[PDB]
Design an enzyme around this catalytic site. Structure first.
Site, PDB file in Angstrom:
ATOM      1  N   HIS C 102       0.820  -1.196   0.000  1.00 49.84           N
ATOM      2  CA  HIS C 102       0.000   0.000   0.000  1.00 49.84           C
ATOM      3  C   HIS C 102       0.867   1.265   0.000  1.00 49.84           C
ATOM      4  CE1 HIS C 102      -3.930  -1.921   1.183  1.00 49.84           C
ATOM      5  NE2 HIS C 102      -3.093  -2.862   1.628  1.00 49.84           N
ATOM      6  N   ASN C 175     -10.194  -2.563   3.356  1.00 47.81           N
ATOM      7  CA  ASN C 175     -10.013  -2.608   1.904  1.00 47.81           C
ATOM      8  C   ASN C 175     -11.353  -2.337   1.236  1.00 47.81           C
ATOM      9  OD1 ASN C 175      -7.256  -3.159   1.804  1.00 47.81           O
ATOM     10  ND2 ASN C 175      -7.430  -5.360   1.671  1.00 47.81           N
ATOM     11  N   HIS C 366      -2.898   1.384  12.102  1.00 46.84           N
ATOM     12  CA  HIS C 366      -2.630   0.001  12.535  1.00 46.84           C
ATOM     13  C   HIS C 366      -3.954  -0.484  13.102  1.00 46.84           C
ATOM     14  CE1 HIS C 366      -0.562  -3.364  14.491  1.00 46.84           C
ATOM     15  NE2 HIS C 366      -1.141  -3.011  15.612  1.00 46.84           N
ATOM     16  N   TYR C 389       1.868  -4.027  12.294  1.00 43.40           N
ATOM     17  CA  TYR C 389       1.779  -2.584  12.056  1.00 43.40           C
ATOM     18  C   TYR C 389       2.504  -1.761  13.120  1.00 43.40           C
ATOM     19  CZ  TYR C 389      -2.131  -3.769   8.781  1.00 43.40           C
ATOM     20  OH  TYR C 389      -2.951  -4.256   7.811  1.00 43.40           O
TER      21      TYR C 389
HETATM   22  C1  HDD Z   1       0.878  -9.645   8.790  1.00 43.27           C
HETATM   23  C2  HDD Z   1       0.960  -8.595   8.091  1.00 43.27           C
HETATM   24  C3  HDD Z   1      -0.267  -8.125   7.298  1.00 43.27           C
HETATM   25  C4  HDD Z   1      -1.486  -8.634   7.087  1.00 43.27           C
HETATM   26  C5  HDD Z   1      -1.990 -10.106   7.217  1.00 43.27           C
HETATM   27  C6  HDD Z   1      -2.226  -7.603   6.322  1.00 43.27           C
HETATM   28  N1  HDD Z   1      -1.422  -6.469   6.328  1.00 43.27           N
HETATM   29 FE1  HDD Z   1      -2.163  -4.590   5.946  1.00 43.27          FE
HETATM   30  N2  HDD Z   1      -0.238  -3.738   6.027  1.00 43.27           N
HETATM   31  C7  HDD Z   1       0.662  -4.491   6.808  1.00 43.27           C
HETATM   32  C8  HDD Z   1       0.848  -5.804   7.186  1.00 43.27           C
HETATM   33  C9  HDD Z   1      -0.241  -6.683   6.951  1.00 43.27           C
HETATM   34  C10 HDD Z   1       1.856  -3.549   7.013  1.00 43.27           C
HETATM   35  C11 HDD Z   1       3.339  -4.183   6.863  1.00 43.27           C
HETATM   36  O1  HDD Z   1       2.209  -3.399   8.480  1.00 43.27           O
HETATM   37  C12 HDD Z   1       1.602  -2.379   6.584  1.00 43.27           C
HETATM   38  C13 HDD Z   1       2.426  -1.584   5.473  1.00 43.27           C
HETATM   39  C14 HDD Z   1       3.139  -0.468   6.169  1.00 43.27           C
HETATM   40  C15 HDD Z   1       2.387  -0.161   7.392  1.00 43.27           C
HETATM   41  O2  HDD Z   1       2.351   0.908   7.954  1.00 43.27           O
HETATM   42  O3  HDD Z   1       1.467  -1.076   7.487  1.00 43.27           O
HETATM   43  C16 HDD Z   1       0.234  -2.468   5.966  1.00 43.27           C
HETATM   44  C17 HDD Z   1      -0.643  -1.475   5.425  1.00 43.27           C
HETATM   45  C18 HDD Z   1      -1.962  -1.628   5.119  1.00 43.27           C
HETATM   46  C19 HDD Z   1      -2.867  -0.606   4.516  1.00 43.27           C
HETATM   47  C20 HDD Z   1      -2.371   0.836   4.251  1.00 43.27           C
HETATM   48  C21 HDD Z   1      -2.484   1.794   5.506  1.00 43.27           C
HETATM   49  C22 HDD Z   1      -1.988   3.194   5.016  1.00 43.27           C
HETATM   50  O4  HDD Z   1      -2.714   3.768   4.183  1.00 43.27           O
HETATM   51  O5  HDD Z   1      -0.891   3.516   5.508  1.00 43.27           O
HETATM   52  C23 HDD Z   1      -4.131  -1.005   4.498  1.00 43.27           C
HETATM   53  C24 HDD Z   1      -5.400  -0.340   3.939  1.00 43.27           C
HETATM   54  C25 HDD Z   1      -4.037  -2.470   4.791  1.00 43.27           C
HETATM   55  N3  HDD Z   1      -2.740  -2.760   5.257  1.00 43.27           N
HETATM   56  C26 HDD Z   1      -5.171  -3.232   4.891  1.00 43.27           C
HETATM   57  C27 HDD Z   1      -5.114  -4.627   5.056  1.00 43.27           C
HETATM   58  C28 HDD Z   1      -6.315  -5.486   5.141  1.00 43.27           C
HETATM   59  C29 HDD Z   1      -7.803  -5.062   5.054  1.00 43.27           C
HETATM   60  C30 HDD Z   1      -5.753  -6.657   5.512  1.00 43.27           C
HETATM   61  C31 HDD Z   1      -6.431  -8.031   5.608  1.00 43.27           C
HETATM   62  C32 HDD Z   1      -7.607  -8.119   6.059  1.00 43.27           C
HETATM   63  C33 HDD Z   1      -4.292  -6.690   5.515  1.00 43.27           C
HETATM   64  N4  HDD Z   1      -4.078  -5.335   5.541  1.00 43.27           N
HETATM   65  C34 HDD Z   1      -3.546  -7.769   6.006  1.00 43.27           C
END
Ligand code: HDD
Ligand code: HDD
Lengths: 727, 309, 727, 83, 84
Positions: C102, C175, C366, C389
């Site tokens: 993202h 999402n 987060h 997060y």
């Molecule tokens: C185990 C890790 C993992 C899992 C299973 C998911 N994500 Fe996530 N996502 C993250 C690890 C992550 C992240 C590594 O931690 C991020 C990227 C950088 C950060 O700040 O957050 C992130 C960012 C991130 C963003 C962007 C936030 C922004 O605008 O900064 C959104 C909208 C989502 N995620 C949504 C989802 C949805 C709806 C999930 C499943 C239902 C999903 N994520 C599962």
């Protein structure tokens, strides 16, 4: 829960109090009415605590901060416990890289003010009016040791002052001796690596007494001048309040008419010059490794504000080449007998920080931070320093926005086209992030140089020569400055220098390095070289005995301003006396002693063989500050023993050793009435001896005589007598 | 110029020598024949020096390492001096954050071998065969002080061992007393902040002798057991060779049949248990703040290898 | 200086204006009186520019920001130029690591308000009263591409909302589709690496159309439900204003009595659901890779604020096992036919940020950031997200003090014992940094859980089972949801899904992967499988033709709420029309045209073959916004061609292509007077065709027809006819 | 220093010289090379001053800058010839 | 339960090790500026062993109360009165 004691004794009074009288505390709670423009500007980030709920960093109130979330009270910790993970994550990343050098340092807030306008020689705004007050933040430091090393080591000390002016931050980043060890900045990593702990095993900490330091010194004679200063008692100051400060390099003052004047910066301690003795300093690194940090902080809490006078050595552009040494060589000092220090202003340090990490550890000082009215010179050590202090904060402070960390922020306006970077705090609203632009009518705009509030323009020094990696031939002289320093010291100071070299070279494992340093000393002064050689079991050769001594410095064979003690500058206010109690003190002696000390601003600490209280002969209840072993003689300036039941402590090993230690370290000792039975512990004649105050009671001239001794700092005449003494 | 003495007395003989008989040196030069699989595997990154030209990090030979590039010999330093800037840049970024706790420590390489196979109670490969050796790297430490603080303070000591096994790294990260001060990890930051230097003035270093530590202890009686051990002579060991080590927690051993056995880990000092006395320990923090570091290094150079059961 | 144009035309008016009428600007300069609590609290870090002097970061005024300091005007740059070095250093460190996933996203500030108190089902303070206004910061994003990748890719989109509540930050990180691709967080790095650019050559950007993505999908049938949504037009939204948002996971609401209710969160777009078509979306990635970011920013500058209704699907705790899917399985949706969405409040995005980097790039959301009144469940994907997060910001935002970066700060109180960390802003005055403490009377203190303003306590869910790395057998069904989704789509939405799979699989180089995917499609629906198979030149086997279809979901054979278009919901306010001009336009057509559009809130862009202006028949001077090639039909919702001198553009290839492209992408076209000569270029019969508005002139009947077409978004009946248009 | 995490970016495999590199620089984040030199400074006698400076020469010599003549005042000015 | 393990340790030490424990506590609490903290710690030692509590209190100039002198010692650890 409501854990504090109902008497409210967990909290220190918000008023000046003597060292040890109350628990120390954050500056803003200890002295809330002590303010300045910088201190006021930090109010946006100060955080309180009382009456607030405990939360996460996201503001969620915590119900149970004693336990992790688990499945069952004896079950496994769950990954969903975000309260635990935030709290441990923050703990886990608390530390930042310590400073490469000067990692150990103690700091405070204060203010500066000039005595008169210096507009005739400099357009620097902070020096333009006696009624213009400039907030400062000062950090004092050692050089080699880590942030967790000890204070009273033998070493140069750093003295850095951040001036928050109306036209920009000016950092004056100096040391406690008027010269540095090396001439060109390219050798800084070699010199520092040689003094720091050796690379295979990381030993020794806080000490130049090891092979690589003395190896480098023996191969680079330019280092001898600052090594002489380090081996003298200058290397072990009694306090940051009792040492001199110097900018070292020749800089320039620029006035409104564009005239440049060469200048060397000085700080004179208004509490006077005073140092410890080596055995005392070394032992004090074990008994209290935080002695200087503690003494600074307590001085400020007691109202004994550290005060320094800024002074300038000024040399006209036309006199650049009129001395025996190069003005741009940082291994050479400008003798005050040739160019006097002109008094410029006073700095008073009057408030401790609230949080050491946030304000002290994260402060960034850099000698390149100058303001219009000041300029640089070609000194080759200063030239390379200008690169290092901006560079190093990219890792130390995490990025290029280190000026946004509260303690570093300018109090005057700052606006430009710089954007982003890690941890960016300022949210720029300018439509433009470049210039020239028309979309914001070119703002913010450049400003022409001028008499006041103008843009920075460098002095148009003429530069002429080829691109060379070459040391100027004018810097190739290494022994006359060392010799001038040596000849300027008193006989007891000279002995302490000989002892410093002797002790340090005795920790050098490879004998040939000792021999090579002794040969360099023979190029400075034969008496010095012979005395150090004798202590190392080394004999000078006939060639060494005939090395001709270096010439005088511009006709001078000595300059008393180089000595700590040749010219008395004693100041007893803020010193401290140990008072050795017994279980039935003569209250009349104690009344006399304490009131005389208080009238001169001298602190006292009541010591005994246990804590609690003792009751004087008249029923006066005396609170005990510490035990004899708990607050050793190393931490005080003088020792007084009042009469009473002396039999109570006459046979106490600690009480006797207390006097033996203070006697060895040349401190004044005063014995009243039956306390004179301790004369036999220190072997004092029946008739008495200079340096020991003794009488039937603490009345009459007893306290005035003790205070006169304190004003001379130590009893130098006792040195021959301490030579023996098993302590 | 500046060269070694004619006699070769600048360099330590590469044989076991008693403390002070020779200048100490890097292990691979002091004992080149002492090897183990881990020490050998570090050969890809070891860098020598004798007979090699002095260069930049980009491999360019340097002709004059005594001066900056300037316009005239008394002139300003030029920005094009890349030799100077690389050298000062590397110096400027030497330091990394020290450990949050246990920042002061001393380490050495060695090896481990089980007395007999423990296959009936554990399937761990490093404990399966008496003639199968496992390289180790061990770090001993204090807890509160910075990496530049003194060794002989009064405190618990850390005793961490990294076993380089054939089935993975196993780290046994223990201390010199059999219990810890607190019960739940959520209080770790509270306990550590209470023993560390106080937040206003960052005093005192390497000492629990200050108000916040005793305040925490007085309000959290769970701490009294480990505080008893710290106040005893266990808190001021004579050497890292003369203290016990413990994993503290109950862990499990799992055999090939799937059976779990609860286990607590111990290290017994084959040099015996020995501690300083307080006055001695405190004065030694000032006379030699590197005493334990030095003593371990020299015992290994002398052949008195630290041995633990 | 004075570069700005004297007429003042460099600065945009500070009032709401339509897309393209003024240059865009930082939010606080564009709409200075649009305020909320969060926006006001950022005022301490907002920095201006007008009327200020250009300085270094240390506050020193700069005289010449055009040149480096050198020895001679053609000489070497000097190391002492600190102004140059600071400026280049800041520039050299502007970038911070982008988000792992993202990284491409666009954000705005706004506010939320409940429709009624929800205290019967949750004690969450922000939902307790309809008059409680909670500031929000929302970031919309794609998933795979970098921060520099294009907006209109085919992909899931992120919809993240940060609520600044009075009891802590609550981040609802969701999402635009109601399920995720995988069940357990342990496989996230595997799915993400399979969708991201392949590791050898880092291709392709912003696309799932490559071997590794379809390899993973073919081997992990749990991914098929979200894959169906991505392959539908859901994967190519028209705008962030016209898509739905879902939290995906079942969470818990906790009320004051401690009763837990399972909940799934939804965001309903008040502007209606709308998506592009694939050829338009892909071409738009090349003509305007910033299309969605631009559209969001300009909608807010025009007053077409993005508005969403927060909705909850609520399930009693006792109904946990009453569906034929597991409520904790994130690959499963809860059909609105079975559990309706309760409308709970409205969110309005009404202000753009001032500085993209400072507010959008540095924002950290987060899902673990919850508040009292909300709680987690055991969904194994949500459980693992809780760790990530917080962890990822230690490198992304440089340390554990990321909550101190302005946009991330809570607006409610935060106090605790955590200290230090890189770039620590807060200066703590608490005498204690630990609890329990007596020296500050144990403040800040813990707070018991309670109905309001109480501390967080987890819901005491019963946990029973062995420590295992095992997938619940209840999650082992992968085809019924995909089928339910498929059967809920209109016939043209089905065709678009077939086309999405067919196009992506054609880019998969290993034919066996395409076949394995078709095999999975045969387990979902034979018609879908056959149509994709036919486009790949693949023949279903005997066995694949006989795979029994998965069971219906709790009796449902479809749910119209899963279709974008099945139930009419379009909204023209904020949509845009392209008007193709000629050199002598029938001014009467333009007036009728523009008056009718303006009454519906529909914008217009006036296009010609060159910039400048044209003059209508009556003398009205019409200003040109862009050329035909400069603002392609891809960027508008409809195309209108007014009468006048058609000859001028009748042979203009760009003018003809504009209509052919819009025709192909199913957009409403309206032709007045002699503009009807263009019917031949898009081959429209003499009697007309539904979707093409034609008339002798552009009266009110003509415009109502055109606006009716625009409310239905696209002309789906034209699909069979675009096959034969060479465009 | 920020992009590649520190001053040891020449140790990241693709950046490594293929020719010899030896000096007295030490430490830094993610330090790979383990220096065995007894000395980390020069001049030193404890390692007989190695690694050693090398005079400039026709081949395999130390870097020496061309001794270009510099003459002018310290100015922030654009050369008129560039206008 | 916080006092039985502390007591087991105390009784397992030699007389000179016990003296050094007393001296360690006495030295450390003498550096605590706030006297009530010292008193509170002395109260905790009285829950461990009265000989230890009294030896420390004597060095701190503190007098145990009558209640402190009557605190019952903690139980032995699984019957152990010491473990060498
Ligand atoms: C185990 C890790 C993992 C899992 C299973 C998911 N994500 Fe996530 N996502 C993250 C690890 C992550 C992240 C590594 O931690 C991020 C990227 C950088 C950060 O700040 O957050 C992130 C960012 C991130 C963003 C962007 C936030 C922004 O605008 O900064 C959104 C909208 C989502 N995620 C949504 C989802 C949805 C709806 C999930 C499943 C239902 C999903 N994520 C599962
Ligand atoms: C070319 C490198 C260089 C050279 C030749 C010098 N130093 Fe420096 N010094 C630095 C490289 C540096 C440094 C790496 O950049 C440091 C450490 C961390 C910091 O912020 O600055 C520093 C810190 C630093 C401090 C600590 C400021 C504080 O309290 O944070 C002081 C007092 C001095 N130095 C003083 C001096 C003086 C008087 C010098 C010679 C006249 C000298 N230094 C030469």
């Amino acid at each position: 829960d409501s854990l504090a004691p109902e008497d409210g004794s967990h909290r220190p009074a918000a008023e000046p109090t003597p060292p040890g009288a109350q628990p120390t505390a954050p500056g803003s709670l200890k002295a809330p009415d002590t303010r300045n423009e910088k201190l006021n500007s930090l109010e946006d980030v100060r955080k309180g605590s009382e009456n607030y709920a405990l939360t996460t960093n996201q503001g969620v109130r915590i119900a149970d901060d004693q336990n992790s979330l688990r499945a069952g009270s004896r079950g496994p910790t769950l990954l969903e416990d975000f309260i635990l993970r935030e709290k441990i994550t923050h703990f886990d990343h608390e530390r930042i890289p310590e400073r490469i050098v000067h990692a150990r340092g103690s700091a405070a807030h204060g203010y500066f003010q000039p005595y008169k306008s210096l507009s005739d020689i400099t357009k620097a705004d902070f020096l333009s009016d006696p009624n213009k007050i400039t907030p400062v933040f000062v950090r004092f430091s050692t050089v080699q040791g880590g942030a967790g090393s000890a204070d009273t080591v033998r070493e140069i000390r750093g003295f850095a002052t951040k001036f928050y002016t109306e036209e920009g931050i000016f950092d004056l980043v100096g040391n406690n001796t008027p010269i540095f060890f090396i001439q060109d900045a390219h050798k800084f990593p070699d010199f520092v690596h040689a003094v720091k702990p050796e690379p295979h095993w990381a030993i020794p900490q806080g000490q130049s007494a090891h092979d690589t330091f003395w190896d480098y010194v023996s191969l680079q004679p330019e280092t001898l001048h600052n090594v002489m200063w380090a081996m003298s008692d200058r290397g072990i100051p009694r306090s940051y309040r009792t040492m001199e400060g110097f900018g070292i390099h020749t800089f320039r003052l620029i006035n409104a008419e564009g005239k440049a004047t060469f200048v060397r910066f000085h700080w004179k301690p208004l509490a006077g010059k005073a140092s410890l003795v080596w055995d005392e300093a070394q032992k004090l690194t074990g008994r209290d490794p935080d002695f200087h940090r503690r003494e600074l902080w307590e001085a400020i809490e007691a109202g004994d504000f550290p005060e320094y006078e800024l002074g300038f050595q000024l040399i006209p552009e036309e006199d650049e080449f009129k001395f025996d040494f190069d003005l741009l060589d940082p291994t050479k000092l400008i003798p005050e007998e040739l160019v006097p220090v002109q008094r410029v202003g006073k700095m008073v340090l009057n408030r401790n920080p609230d949080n050491f990490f946030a304000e002290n550890e994260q402060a960034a000082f850099h000698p390149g931070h100058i303001v219009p009215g000041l300029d640089f010179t070609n000194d080759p050590l200063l030239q390379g320093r200008l690169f290092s202090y901006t560079d190093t904060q990219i890792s130390r402070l995490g990025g290029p926005n280190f000026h946004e960390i509260p303690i570093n922020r300018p109090t005057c306006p700052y606006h430009n086209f710089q954007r982003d970077g890690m941890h960016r705090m300022g949210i720029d609203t300018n439509p433009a992030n470049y210039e020239p632009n028309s979309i914001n009518d070119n703002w913010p705009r450049e400003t022409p140089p001028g008499p006041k509030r103008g843009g920075f323009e460098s002095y148009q020094e003429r530069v002429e020569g080829n691109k060379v990696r070459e040391r100027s031939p004018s810097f190739g002289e290494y022994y006359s400055h060392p010799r001038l320093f040596w000849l300027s010291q008193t006989p007891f100071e000279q002995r302490h220098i000989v002892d410093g070299f002797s002790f340090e070279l005795s920790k050098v494992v490879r004998p040939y390095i000792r021999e090579r340093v002794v040969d360099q000393l023979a190029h400075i002064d034969l008496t010095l070289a012979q005395a150090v050689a004798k202590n190392l079991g080394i004999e000078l050769t006939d060639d060494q005995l005939n090395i001709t001594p270096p010439p005088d410095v511009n006709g001078l064979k000595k300059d008393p301003s180089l000595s700590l003690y040749a010219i008395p500058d004693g100041d007893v206010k803020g010193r401290v006396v140990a008072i050795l109690l017994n279980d039935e003190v003569r209250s009349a002696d104690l009344l006399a002693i304490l009131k005389a000390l208080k009238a001169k601003g001298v602190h006292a600490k009541l010591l005994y063989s246990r804590m609690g209280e003792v009751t004087a002969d008249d029923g006066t209840v005396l609170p005990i500050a510490a035990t004899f072993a708990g607050a050793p003689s190393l931490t005080v300036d003088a020792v007084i023993v009042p009469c009473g039941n002396i039999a109570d402590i006459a046979d106490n090993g600690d009480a006797n050793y207390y006097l033996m230690e203070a006697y060895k370290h040349l401190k004044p000792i005063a014995l009243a009435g039956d306390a004179r039975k301790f004369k036999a512990t220190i072997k004092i004649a029946d008739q008495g001896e200079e340096g020991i105050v003794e009488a039937d009671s603490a009345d009459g001239s007893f306290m005035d005589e003790l205070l006169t001794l304190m004003a001379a700092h130590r009893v130098w005449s006792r040195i021959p007598k301490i030579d023996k003494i098993p302590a």
